[PDB]
Amino acid sequence: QVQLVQSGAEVKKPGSSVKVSCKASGGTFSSLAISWVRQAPGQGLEWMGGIIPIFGTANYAQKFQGRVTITADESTSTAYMELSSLRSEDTAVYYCARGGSVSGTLVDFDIWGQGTMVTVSSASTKGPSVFPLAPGTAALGCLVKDYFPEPVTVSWNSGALTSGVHTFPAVLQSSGLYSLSSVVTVPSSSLGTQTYICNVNHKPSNTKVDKKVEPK
Amino acid sequence: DIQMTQSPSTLSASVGDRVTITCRASQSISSWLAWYQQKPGKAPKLLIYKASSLESGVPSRFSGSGSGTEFTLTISSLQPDDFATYYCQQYNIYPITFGGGTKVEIKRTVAAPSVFIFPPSDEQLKSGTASVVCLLNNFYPREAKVQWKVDNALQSGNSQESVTEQDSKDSTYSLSSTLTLSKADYEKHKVYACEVTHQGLSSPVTKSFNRGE
Amino acid sequence: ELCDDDPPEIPHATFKAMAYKEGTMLNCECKRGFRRIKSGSLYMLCTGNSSHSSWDNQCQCMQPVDQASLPGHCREPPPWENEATERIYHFVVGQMVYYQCVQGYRALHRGPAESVCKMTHGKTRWTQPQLICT
Numbered sequence: 001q002v003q004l005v006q007s008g009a010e011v012k013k014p015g016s017s018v019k020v021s022c023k024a025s026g027g028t029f030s031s032l033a034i035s036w037v038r039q040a041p042g043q044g045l046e047w048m049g050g051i052i053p054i055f056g057t058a059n060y061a062q063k064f065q066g067r068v069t070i071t072a073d074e075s076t077s078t079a080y081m082e083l084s085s086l087r088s089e090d091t092a093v094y095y096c097a098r099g100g101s102v103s104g105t106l107v108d109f110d111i112w113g114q115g116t117m118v119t120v121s122s123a124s125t126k127g128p129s130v131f132p133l134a135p136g137t138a139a140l141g142c143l144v145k146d147y148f149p150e151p152v153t154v155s156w157n158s159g160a161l162t163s164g165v166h167t168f169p170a171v172l173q174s175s176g177l178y179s180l181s182s183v184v185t186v187p188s189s190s191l192g193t194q195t196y197i198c199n200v201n202h203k204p205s206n207t208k209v210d211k212k213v214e215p216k
Numbered sequence: 217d218i219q220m221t222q223s224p225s226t227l228s229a230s231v232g233d234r235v236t237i238t239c240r241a242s243q244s245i246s247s248w249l250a251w252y253q254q255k256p257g258k259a260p261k262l263l264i265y266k267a268s269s270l271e272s273g274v275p276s277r278f279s280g281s282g283s284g285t286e287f288t289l290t291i292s293s294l295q296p297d298d299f300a301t302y303y304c305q306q307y308n309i310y311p312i313t314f315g316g317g318t319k320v321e322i323k324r325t326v327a328a329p330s331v332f333i334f335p336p337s338d339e340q341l342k343s344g345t346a347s348v349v350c351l352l353n354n355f356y357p358r359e360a361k362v363q364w365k366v367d368n369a370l371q372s373g374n375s376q377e378s379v380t381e382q383d384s385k386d387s388t389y390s391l392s393s394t395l396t397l398s399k400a401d402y403e404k405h406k407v408y409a410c411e412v413t414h415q416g417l418s419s420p421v422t423k424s425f426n427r428g429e
Numbered sequence: 430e431l432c433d434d435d436p437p438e439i440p441h442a443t444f445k446a447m448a449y450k451e452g453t454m455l456n457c458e459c460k461r462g463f464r465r466i467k468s469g470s471l472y473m474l475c476t477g478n479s480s481h482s483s484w485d486n487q488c489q490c491m492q493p494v495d496q497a498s499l500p501g502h503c504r505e506p507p508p509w510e511n512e513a514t515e516r517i518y519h520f521v522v523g524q525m526v527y528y529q530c531v532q533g534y535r536a537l538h539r540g541p542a543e544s545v546c547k548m549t550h551g552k553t554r555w556t557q558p559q560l561i562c563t
Binding site for chain 1: 248250252258259260261262265266271303305307308309310311312313314315316317330332334336337338339340343347349351353376377378379380383390392394396
């Protein structure tokens, strides 16, 4: 019944603060603890802290060194998590979660928010450059390079081609920009007749590229 | 802090199998342990609380046992919805801590990778950087090693890789590795090769190209 | 409108209101050695209209502005000088209070632990939170 709806993705510079919200939908907070747990890309879960609504009592993980503040607005059933002096290591999906019982903040988490991606980086918005990966079976693709922030989307032949497609997770380069590759295997006998197009969209920079991948 | 150690880190199983995941605490946590399931891009879901109490709405094929420092999560007769990562959590004392996760993946027959190598495009070369890409396609199991060589000189520190999740149709993995060089260094060498090690191959396979050929 | 009984006491737990309904009363109690002012109010009463709620008939035994709340509910009244350490509240029908185990105690009860004052069979009664703190 009760659900938790979190605020949208944030892109932040190092040294700044971020304030994420967690709103109860289809109910109220009651006195059940509202806690925050984060997960860095490809890593496990890490507890940050929790607050008891109405009572106002909050507990935090000492490793945050006072950088986390958790508050609750009982009238609007919204909890907030503010993380100050952001650094690249704070890049993570942040979740809010309700406690299973009125046992303070040392509880199991029975209801979770959908998550809020927070990216901390010195990089500025930049659309990708799209390079071809030129071709029994042939492999071809696109290298979607040097963009920021995530995400990019890739389709092939405007969605008409899905068989044999593999779109890899993006990697963060040492430059601070992301790179993503998307490939597809096709019959070599089709290369003289068919045109394969990778359609790349990067909504943060309003960039849209439809790259024909030609047999070099 | 209490350190929660989960094992195995990963396990391969089929629909119908029984899986046992273990969580060990560095100190006693009484029975204040919970288990969660998490699918990629989604929030964790509570399965069990207080070491053995099944959460409302969670199927009875999930059961938890343990006390003190040793706990297990057992899934009897695994179903397609159960391939996911599982985490344990202690809430005996602050700070609340989680285990490192156990990925439950689909067992299938061994499949050697189909390997492809791509030189940098002429369009990319026009901007001063060269990306050479090696593709390892539709292999099983996930363990695969890629080794880059330029004129037989082994490369280190100049490559990045990423792997897909198990394919929804054939349960294989695919991996892409990218070797990054300056256009100046790229034009100074001729042979570009990627050597792939995988248990489906009788010996490592090398795919290569000659620059300008 | 007042509930004769105080909300249920749960061993090793405390309760608190999120906001006080209109009609809630609070005794004008004073600290040891201090007495209630002559001809003064014996109770503060939460009142309201279409624009705001507030406490009427102020107690007497710091901040110049005592902000009103939105209609239908009052906030915790600010402390008055030489006030007793314990607050004696008298709630009305429809009032909800919320429970939490005291730190070091835990509940097997799943979900919210609340009590509401209801008018049942011509008399007021608080619902029983199904809460045990161990």
